[PDB]
Write a protein that binds this ligand. Sequence first.
Ligand code: ZN
Lengths: 87, 118, 216, 54, 205, 97
Amino acid sequence: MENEAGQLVDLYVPRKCSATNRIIQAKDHASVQINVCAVDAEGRQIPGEKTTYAISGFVRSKGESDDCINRLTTQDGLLEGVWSYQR
Amino acid sequence: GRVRTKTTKRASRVVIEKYYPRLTLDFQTNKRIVDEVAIIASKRLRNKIAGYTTHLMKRIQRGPVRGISFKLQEEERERKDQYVPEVSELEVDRVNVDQDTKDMLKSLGYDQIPVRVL
Amino acid sequence: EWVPVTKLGRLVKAGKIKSIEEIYLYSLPIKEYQIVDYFLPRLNDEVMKVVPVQKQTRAGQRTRFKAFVVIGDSDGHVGLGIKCAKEVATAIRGAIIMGKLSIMPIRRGYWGTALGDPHTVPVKVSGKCGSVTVRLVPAPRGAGLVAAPVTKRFLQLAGIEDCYTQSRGSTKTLGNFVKAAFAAASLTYGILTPNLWAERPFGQTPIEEYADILMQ
Amino acid sequence: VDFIDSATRHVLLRQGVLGVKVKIMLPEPKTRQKKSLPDIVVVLDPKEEEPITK
Amino acid sequence: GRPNILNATDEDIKQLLAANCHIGSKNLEVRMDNYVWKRRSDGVHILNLGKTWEKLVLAARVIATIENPADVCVVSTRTYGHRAVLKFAAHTGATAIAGRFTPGNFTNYITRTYREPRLIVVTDPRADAQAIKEASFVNIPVIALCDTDSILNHVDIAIPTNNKGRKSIGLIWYLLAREVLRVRGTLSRSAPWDVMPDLYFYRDP
Amino acid sequence: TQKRRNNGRNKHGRGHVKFVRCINCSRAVPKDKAIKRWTIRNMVETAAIRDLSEASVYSEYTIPKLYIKLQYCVSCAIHSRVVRVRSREGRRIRTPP
RNA sequence: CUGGUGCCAGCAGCCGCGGUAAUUCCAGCUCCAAUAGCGUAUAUUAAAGUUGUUGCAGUUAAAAAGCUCGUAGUUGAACU
RNA sequence: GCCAAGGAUGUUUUCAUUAAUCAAGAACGAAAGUUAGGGGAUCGAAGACGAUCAGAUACCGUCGUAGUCUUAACCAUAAACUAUGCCGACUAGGGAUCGGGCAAUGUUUCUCGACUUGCUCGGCACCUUACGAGAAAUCAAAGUCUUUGGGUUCC
RNA sequence: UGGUGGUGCAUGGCCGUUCUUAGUUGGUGGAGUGAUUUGUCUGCUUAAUUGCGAUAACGAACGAGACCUUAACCUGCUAA
RNA sequence: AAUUUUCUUU
Ligand SMILES: [Zn+2]
């Protein structure tokens, strides 16, 4: 949020889980970040280039983290033939 | 009852893991070695520790024991862990048979192994 | 002279993390209060009560003192500490340590047009603990804190200059009252306000950023 | 008997006389003879030898 | 994304079939139905081998991107996966926790076993729910070698395998070590691995 | 508080059930509330098999048995120790030991 | 804090203090709150989310008619 | 055996809003209790004795009237309980059970039945868990309530 | 100043019981809003919370044990 | 089988 001056005044901007679009509280100790690096020809994944996902504790307890991570990677193009939108 | 105290158990285990090669068969010799290395305030405590040490050696010689380590079978475990047979999964051409398994294998990307099952 | 025993503690001691808001952003658990002591200095506390609970025994009654403390100076940082101990002195000290470990960020908004610094809660928040419900309502500039003495003191440490309060249940239970108020305040950074709809770029975390400056 | 060096005294006050008992554990070497309690037993560390020695 | 270098490689899938990694026991848990093919008779579920490999390479990817391999921990309280985890930590820089988990490993900074890893790889979530619980307490991602009869609670990446057969457990652990070594460590896909998959196998004292 | 979810008897989808008589004290206990046991005892003790065989006819005939259904009340069952008071956690099990 | 009585006198809105060491009884000293004003008795209002449309509660604290039909009353699918 | 009626299921059958909850008013309403007729085996209020006890007036044994059965008239309450009103929508995983229906180049016994598997509708329930609720015991409703409003009675 | 005068229901010190037995408590963690609980236990064994073992507990402290005294044979090791 | 009672406080 911005005041009348225009700058951003707040303690911090919480990050939102990519699986449910809900913010992660400071005490969400079951909310983890998954980091996966891209790969080139003949393997040998180049360090420094990676894609990140955040999964909230609510999803982790509900048990939907596996399918949510499958959807995220399939949409990004990192996995093939694992998750399908038509069940 | 002659139940050994926890101090005797811990002290006996420590000397066993520290001076296993130095140990001998005779209990009196084992008493002598403990008096030589391990300084114990009481002769009675020294004899009790030596007696437990002798019984531990008797049972260890008769069979392996878990919670003591002295440059020994705790290394022979990895020596025998390096063992490798001639790939038990290699077979030649016939692994198993299942109609649904074959259908999935043929569908996805692969062809191998015959059919039979039931 | 305190020596850290955690990876986050070592990073904080070195100075890799520039603010505790980063640790709050990645929701990294805090096990040592020295991290909070380093990040938030000049943090004053306030003791609310010392409840002498008892435990009947075969011979007599075993009594221990239970202390409640709220801590936080003036800026969106409050912490609740509850400690039971044989002596009041150690009970108080443990309460300070737990309050420091339990410091939480508080979101402060505006009642109307955003002219100046935040003074009130952005949205109506609520917190229930043991049938005691505390509801915080945004208030216009003025009228200060309309709350119970303990609740007003608690909100005076989070930097909320103006706030309406509503209480329901057995408010005489101080522990449940302060727990519900703390839950309501911590809920402020839990509501998805429309201004937060923007897709923030995902970060790294201090552990991943300094995985190479942390080795021995 | 050798590690609980203690003292007891009566202090007079406006109310009834109070009794003060102060007991200090002298360090383990303070036995006037020895250092080790008969419950603590230490074991020395030997030196490993070469199992071949050419 | 996924290049053509991740080819069919019929040899490994034949190893999977020989190791019997495609059999579930009896029961399904909804959260593990997308990984199975058409159900075999006599109440045995067949897992999708292609999906299993895709999850395995994804697990290898998430095991990578860790600068310190010691921050990756592998836990298997089952005796079948004891030496498999030991060989996994012997080949890659991971740390092996086999036997008793000693609850308080992830919390309770006082205890001497306070390790604080960055990622957890587990064999049986049912038998090792304590480790997953501790990881969920202390903000640690968890990947599991789950079967069709597994509870996918606090599990991010689950590889559908037998999870009960010694051959399957050893084979999947060997494959995971091979994939992570190929990804970053030293190994090349065009060349075979001197380390034999049969090494990871256990049981029969 | 409800000590038992089923209120101590198997009454689901019913409004009334017939009451049986306890064997020992002859108390009226409902059919779904009476503790039922099946005494299946040989007509003679196992220590008299040799004596019966040496004093029997019919070239090794089969020795009959007796089948008695015993329906105890709560108090009588507890006194007879066929059913015992268990802990709160152990109350939620129904499989015989 | 100092003196007098000792489950007595009594104090006391409730908890509650008093049986010879009474920070709660009566005498002195001082302090605290309002101020030319203060207390007490009664009626009423807020607190009372203990009248609850907003906004109560009904398994165990007070509270689901033994059950069903049924007219006033209340509420009433979508579609122009 | 006869008669009337009922739920669920199947249905490319029929009508078309005819519906939900109710004051007032009515039907049924365990057991015990009442008025007349029949019948009264067993048990058994009241009672009679006989043991226990300091006193037992009760618990124990035997006998024993009303009653326990039934018809024609009465009343109208029980911890009448799921201590949880009725209708409607949504919400997590699994396995048993009852009734119906669908499917099997399934099994079996001289066209059907029995058994096995999967799916589905409507019930009786059960295990684990808590996104959620409660003061907690606990609850798939007692959840979808300080983020408080689907409708309607009783209290 | 003195009081073997009272008050052991004002006290200190000492002693006796609970207790001829095996019990009791921190720190960090887990559970519960909370009083509290786990740790301190299914089982087996012991004089013993004695020890094996499982194990949301891990690492510890007191007690027990350990410890000290007392009664039994002889070494011509330095003697009467 | 059989087992009734523990005044008001400190
Ligand atoms: Zn009976």
